Amino acid sequence: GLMQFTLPVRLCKEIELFHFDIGPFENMWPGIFVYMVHRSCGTSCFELEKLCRFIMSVKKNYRRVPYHNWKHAVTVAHCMYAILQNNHTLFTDLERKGLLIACLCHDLDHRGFSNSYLQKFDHPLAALYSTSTMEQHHFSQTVSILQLEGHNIFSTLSSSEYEQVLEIIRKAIIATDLALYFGNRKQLEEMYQTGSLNLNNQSHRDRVIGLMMTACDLCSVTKLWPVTKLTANDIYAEFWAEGDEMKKLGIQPIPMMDRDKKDEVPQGQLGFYNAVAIPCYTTLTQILPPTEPLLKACRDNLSQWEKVIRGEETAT
Ligand SMILES: Cn1ncc(C(N)=O)c1C(=O)Nc1ccc2[nH]c(-c3cccc(Cl)c3)nc2c1
Ligand SMILES: [Mg+2]
Ligand SMILES: [Zn+2]
Numbered sequence: 589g590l591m592q593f594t595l596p597v598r599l600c601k602e603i604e605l606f607h608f609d610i611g612p613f614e615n616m617w618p619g620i621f622v623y624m625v626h627r628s629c630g631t632s633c634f635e636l637e638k639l640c641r642f643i644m645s646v647k648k649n650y651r652r653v654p655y656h657n658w659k660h661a662v663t664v665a666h667c668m669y670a671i672l673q674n675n676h677t678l679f680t681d682l683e684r685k686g687l688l689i690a691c692l693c694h695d696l697d698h699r700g701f702s703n704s705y706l707q708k709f710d711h712p713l714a715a716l717y718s719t720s721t722m723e724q725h726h727f728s729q730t731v732s733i734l735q736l737e738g739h740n741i742f743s744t745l746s747s748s749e750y751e752q753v754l755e756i757i758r759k760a761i762i763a764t765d766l767a768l769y770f771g772n773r774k775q776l777e778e779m780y781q782t783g784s785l786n787l788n789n790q791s792h793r794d795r796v797i798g799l800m801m802t803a804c805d806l807c808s809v810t811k812l813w814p815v816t817k818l819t820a821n822d823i824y825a826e827f828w829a830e831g832d833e834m835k836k837l838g839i840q841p842i843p844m845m846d847r848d849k850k851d852e853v854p855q856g857q858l859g860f861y862n863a864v865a866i867p868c869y870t871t872l873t874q875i876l877p878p879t880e881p882l883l884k885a886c887r888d889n890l891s892q893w894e895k896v897i898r899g900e901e902t903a904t
Pocket of ligand 3: 660664694695764805
């Protein structure tokens with residue numbers, strides 16, 4: 589275990605920032621992920637050769653879609669790294685291990701379509717899994733990959749530790765279904781405001797980890813403006829392809845998925861920062877005060893979208 593992963597000077601500094609962008613060199617992202625695992629977990633959490641084989645099989649089962657791709661997996665994992673490193677006294681050995689892996693695996697085999705498009709299309713995944721359809725598919729892909737030869741990165745855990753870390757990963761992946769976020773955040777807001785929240789309660793921990801997953805999964809809204817604006821182009825590239833598919837079934841798409849409604853994107857973003865993102869990072873900051881820079885960069889990008897609405901800025 590005398591093989592440390594090292595990063596160039598600028599990446600070693602800036603990867604500690606919540607707003608870090610992992611860059612356009614795909615062949616560096618496995619190295620970045622391993623480095624974050626060695627520092628947040630430890631060099632002996634996993635055998636390097638199995639982790640590397642795992643990472644490359646995971647990469648292989650992400651698709652060449654505009655947004656829900658391999659670069660999103662690593663980006664979401666980096667946001668979990670920042671949260672873990674700035675809160676290191678609060679999490680267990682098994683939570684460190686499981687959570688970066690859950691983030692890497694959390695959108696495995698995404699085709700760029702929502703749970704609603706699978707219901708309206710009558711995709712077979714919708715018969716198998718009636719709610720959190722894609723998310724139950726992503727967990728199931730995670731299990732397939734763990735069961736490939738030489739891919740059990742959790743080989744040294746007991747039977748009952750292996751079962752807990754898989755349950756951490758299952759719950760974390762299910763939580764990235766944004767339809768569940770609204771309930772989970774309501775519950776955590778009441779629990780914090782009445783002072784009933786208890787990190788020794790497993791059902792409370794599950795809720796906090798879920799919100800952590802929502803925060804990590806939306807983290808595009810918490811990058812510097814040019815990253816935030818450029819990533820919104822890839823998100824809408826997918827939404828509009830899905831709305832096209834909705835039209836082919838003879839169904840009117842909701843406005844965010846209609847490419848004809850392109851000029852209303854700035855007002856849509858504002859709707860989404862006020863109804864989803866700001867509440868998300870506000871609640872997470874109350875629970876984990878050191879996650880502050882996420883909410884701060886969210887508020888900053890809200891102003892940016894407001895400048896776009898008043899013509900002081902453009903977005904093509
Ligand atoms: C930035 N980011 N990061 C993660 C996600 C995510 N997974 O949702 C998003 C995101 O952009 N979501 C989003 C949600 C609701 C929207 N509603 C409109 C919208 C409404 C009315 C007219 C128009 Cl034209 C458009 N746009 C939306 C975008
Ligand atoms: Mg997802
Ligand atoms: Zn995601």
